[PDB]
């Protein structure tokens, strides 16, 4: 009750995680020793407050991609972003469904009579336009 | 649109407007040859007619006056004439 960490602890822990992710783990005491020897923290209480938040943040990172950013998480992010170009295109449907109105649009721009272009009938209807007011 | 051309409108925009407010005003009404079954002659009923018109030979009703347009009676051919 009343254990919110200030922005000094939070941003110090974030920079520590960003720079020295490889030497930290989910153990408070080894993280405490690492933060002792890689940063000049003037007081013991601040030191192990920072170490506690580092431990909490590494549990969060081991769950998923919080900020961040780890090099492994970011390289796998750009791997997902860059790779999975599929082996077959998603736009090669080989059967394209068209309204007869779009068929006529293509017909008047000289492409409506050489493509595959499977056509349906128009929907008897005009029941768009969700009812006005409440219910 | 800043460069709408006001003196060459498309015919659909011309038909869409009021009968005034066109470049040159023109009526939306017309005349027509109305033919009823059982007779031989035709009558030249106005489209927006207000009179209960009658065929002079056979005293039968051709059109019934309504709010905007004369409603012709049960089945009778009509030919809009000279457009």
């Amino acid at each position: 009750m009343g254990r919110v960490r200030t922005k000094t602890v939070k941003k110090a822990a974030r920079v520590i995680i960003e720079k020295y992710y490889t030497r930290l783990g989910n153990d408070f005491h080894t993280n405490k020793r690492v933060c002792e020897e890689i940063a000049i923290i003037p007081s013991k209480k601040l030191r192990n407050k920072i170490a506690g938040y580092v431990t909490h943040l590494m549990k969060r990172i081991q769950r998923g991609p919080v900020r961040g950013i780890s090099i492994k998480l970011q390289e796998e992010e750009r791997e997902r972003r860059d790779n999975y170009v599929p082996e077959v295109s998603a736009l090669d449907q080989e059967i394209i469904e068209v309204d007869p109105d779009t068929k006529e649009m293509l017909k008047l721009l000289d492409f409506g009579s050489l493509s595959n272009l499977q056509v349906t009938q128009p929907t008897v209807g005009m029941n768009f336009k969700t009812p006005r007011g409440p219910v | 649109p800043l460069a709408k051309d006001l003196l060459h409108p498309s015919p659909e925009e011309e038909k869409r407007k009021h009968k005034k407010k066109r470049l040159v005003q023109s009526p939306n009404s017309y005349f027509m040859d109305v033919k009823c079954p059982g007779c031989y002659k035709i009558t030249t009923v106005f489209s927006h007619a207000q009179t209960v018109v009658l065929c002079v030979g056979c005293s039968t009703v051709l059109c019934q006056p309504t709010g905007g347009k004369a409603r012709l009676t049960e089945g009778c051919s009509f030919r809009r004439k000279q457009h």
């Binding site: 997902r80 999975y84 170009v85 008897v124 005009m126 | -």
Partner: protein, 221 residues
């Protein structure tokens, strides 16, 4: 163009019809009615693809006219287009801002991310109104991808395709990149581009994990 070389070449018509890119209803903005063909019986407006193609080519001309390639700035607030603008900047050499646009990027000269571009290309006028307004502050011309109901306030080279579906957004960024690189000399314009347009498509996390587990179970078996 009026040239025969800059004509439609119906392979991309098949790409357009597969992705969407011609269905934009049901609201029509009064400055976008120049680009529609007509309205479907179910309320959707149909967009004439000749106008889309030639507005795209005009935009590509304007992008090519910038001598320094890292002065075109490409913007996408939404994710469906964040991927496309990142790959577009990779292909052409533009400068992307994918995600949150911090206000004062173009006007506050003191701050660190003070970009000073010469052209601005925007996925959605309605979702990227803040870069449009700042472009009005710093006399910066603007190109945008516009649906049938997108307001054209600070837009100059509005390209009327579609910006709801992920496929249409990825496809139009793909063809903008292809035309920009073809007007410069990188692709000889006779054989198709090696980059397949699925590279620019948005992928939500659930279908990503479904695809990756399907690929894992296929590879192990």
């Amino acid at each position: 163009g009026a040239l025969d070389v800059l004509q439609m070449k119906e392979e991309d018509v098949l790409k357009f019809l597969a992705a969407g890119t011609h269905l934009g209803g049901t609201n029509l903005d009064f400055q976008m009615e120049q680009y529609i063909y007509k309205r479907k019986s179910d309320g959707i407006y149909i967009i004439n693809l000749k106008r889309t193609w030639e507005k795209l080519l005009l935009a590509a001309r304007a992008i090519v006219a910038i001598e320094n390639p890292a002065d075109v700035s490409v913007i996408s607030s939404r994710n469906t287009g964040q991927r496309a603008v990142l790959k577009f900047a990779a292909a052409t050499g533009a400068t992307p801002i994918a995600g949150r646009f911090t206000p004062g990027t173009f006007t506050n000269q003191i701050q660190a991310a003070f970009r000073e571009p010469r052209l601005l290309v925007v996925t959605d006028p309605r979702a990227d109104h803040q870069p449009l307004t700042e472009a009005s502050y710093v006399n910066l011309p603007t190109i945008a991808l516009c649906n049938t109901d997108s307001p054209l306030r600070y837009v100059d080279i509005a390209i009327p395709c579609n910006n709801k579906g992920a496929h249409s957004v990825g496809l139009m960024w793909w063809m903008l990149a292809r035309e920009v690189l073809r007007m410069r000399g990188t692709i000889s314009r006779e054989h198709p581009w090696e980059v397949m347009p699925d590279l620019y498509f948005y992928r939500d996390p659930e279908e990503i994990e479904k695809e990756e587990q399907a690929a894992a179970e296929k590879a192990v078996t």
